[model samples]
Target: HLLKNPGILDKIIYAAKIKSSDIVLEIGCGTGNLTVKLLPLAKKVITIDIDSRMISEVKKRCLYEGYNNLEVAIKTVFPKFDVCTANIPYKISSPLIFKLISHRPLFKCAVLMFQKEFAERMLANVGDSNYSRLTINVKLFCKVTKVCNVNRSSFNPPPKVDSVIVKLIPKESSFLTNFDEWDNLLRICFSRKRKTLHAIFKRNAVLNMLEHNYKNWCTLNKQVPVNFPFKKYCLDVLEHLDMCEKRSINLDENDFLKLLLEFNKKGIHFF
Candidate 1:
């Protein structure tokens, strides 16, 4: 997945804003075209790939360039680093992003290349057509902004679709204490993004699942599970917060946070 266009390569480097004292991580460094540029600028470059042939080629390029402030590995690795650069593979984009977001010692910024649709989803607003779980999840942790769009021809074997680049700077601090509940809440809401909260929660299957989870939560906490109208209770919680008529597609991250807070307060655990 070499970036064949020289112009796009320089654009990615410029977008990364690499510094002399920064330690950079380069993911999927095919051919080391970007690696060579990174070596001369950053203090130390760490490159990772699953292919040994590509890794060897990268090593050779480093040698020919007379640069030694580099580290090469064959598979996945996450270490403390100040900056990140990547031309991400389509398959690992989602999991790789989650790993980076949950990583400790928050990175300064990541300049990444992604499929165009995926990149737009990352920057999507509340009511945008491309908005989805990815938008809210990623937005909850980082500030993502578009950099530039690269045509399909930018790659060695042009992908059927075009690509876009973005820069993500993780928030310095977070307010979240229980991540599972937060994510679980969204899973239910976004199951049918266009459906009203009242309609979504009123489903027998949804209430049954919530009841089972609540029972487990109470058992874990050594509390007696109350026998109440679970379906009505869920609806009441949403109505009380004036969210019963709200659709998930129209709600923003803060709205979800507020809904989650109210649900947790009523002993309706999502985990």
Candidate 2:
């Protein structure tokens, strides 16, 4: 039934900007619904499914249908490709999308189906109702836009919530000093979404954690007051590390680069 729905397929293909030279990767190619349509658009299509039964069925169907361009793989992790298109399962949508984007850089874009609320959160802006760490982190690399919306009635067994199609195009890349440190900062700040920045930092024991080097940090802090020259401290650190004035949503991309350089200068191990 999903395969027979040409409207949805057409929308996906058109929104994804499929090209003949593209090498596409489809995650969760259940029964090859979207895979069959993708095969004709790309040079090659690598489809994967976590379920062994679904993979076997899709493989057999592809072989029988003479889809030589299609290669079916059953694996937990998806391989790299030029583009990623998926009707992602509801339960793993957030983690799966994060894993795919973090792990695969070759893929220039992703078209994913996610729950409506999750989709909104991904595309939310700072200070918006749905704004969150996920939004900021994703915005660091990709520009997310809503392509279309789907209802529960579109699926065989109706889901509890409506779904939406989103297109994520990688726009720019930033050098993060340490993934762990960056993640830690985000976790600390966003864990308490409603709290003020100072309150968040205070409650998270950030000061205590840096107590050993508190004097040095304080010296730097004193050199650049937050109020007198807005962003002076951040700019001093950023400029010293060759970064521009981009606000740090828990330390922006350039902030990460600056952090790495500063850490090296101070002989600190980020790990």
Candidate 3:
């Protein structure tokens, strides 16, 4: 079943504000349904699907239909395009979103369809239940808007959940300088989302695991003395910024960038 179908072909064409000069990429181009419709509207259209069967079928269908502007691929090691449109699989939603946002040959914007709850979370504001590290990370890179809603019945074999369409316009430049470190911190802090940020960092098992990994990472980076206390390190930095009492979810993109810069300047190697 197609979740949030939203007449995606039309929606994308409209949302992208397609220009004759634009190049488009469509992810998970099932059966070339959307691919065929997209070809005449843009300069070029490259549609990708992870499944070999789907790719073959789409390729056959597009060729049979004489759609020469459409090209189908199994997977992409590098995405080169202007606009991205996808009705993504629910399971790969998070990774897919991150991959697209961080990808090169950058896009002007993305028109994505996701499960309604996940879509809402992406568009959530601070202090909302859906406001989280994931949301913040996305916010740091793009302006996400919930554009349209669709019901389960729109598809031939309906998905159990409702869905929504979202448009993400990338910021001119990302706020995050150290994406790897920011991601690691989020994993640690949100693993136990209910725990206070301080407590999460102080958990003995977590700390020990981090220390072991940090020591190895430092060695790789040609650094020595990897004995920093993980909990105190974060607390001290937050205190210096007067945010010691705030939860990790409450910190915005600016806050993370500031903390990361401070840590680097202090010769702190949490790895």
Error (Å) of candidate 2 at residue 263 is 8.4
The runs of at least 3 residues in candidate 3 whose Cα sits more than 4 Å from the true structure, single-residue gaps closed, are: 2-8, 50-66, 73-75, 194-196, 200-234
For model 2, residues 1-271, the per-residue Cα lDDT tens digits are 1433558778888988888999898877877878878887898998776678888887778778878888762236666688888877666777876675466454778898888888888877665657776776677667789989887778766767788899988754442324565556566556666664445434435544443343455465574322432224323444565434333343444444456566445433222
Poorly placed runs, candidate 2 (over 4 Å): 1-4, 73-75, 175-177, 212-271
Which run of 10 residues does model 3 get worst, by summed lDDT?
262-271
TM-score of 1: 0.90
Can you write out model 1's per-residue Cα lDDT over 143-237, one digit (the tens) per residue?
89988999988878877989899999887754354667777888988899999999999999988988888778788889887667777777888
Candidate achieving higher lDDT, 1 or 2: 1
Each prediction's RMSD to truth: 2.3, 6.5, 3.7
TM-score of each: 0.90, 0.75, 0.80
lDDT of each: 0.84, 0.66, 0.73
Best by lDDT: 1
Ranked by TM-score, top first: 1, 3, 2
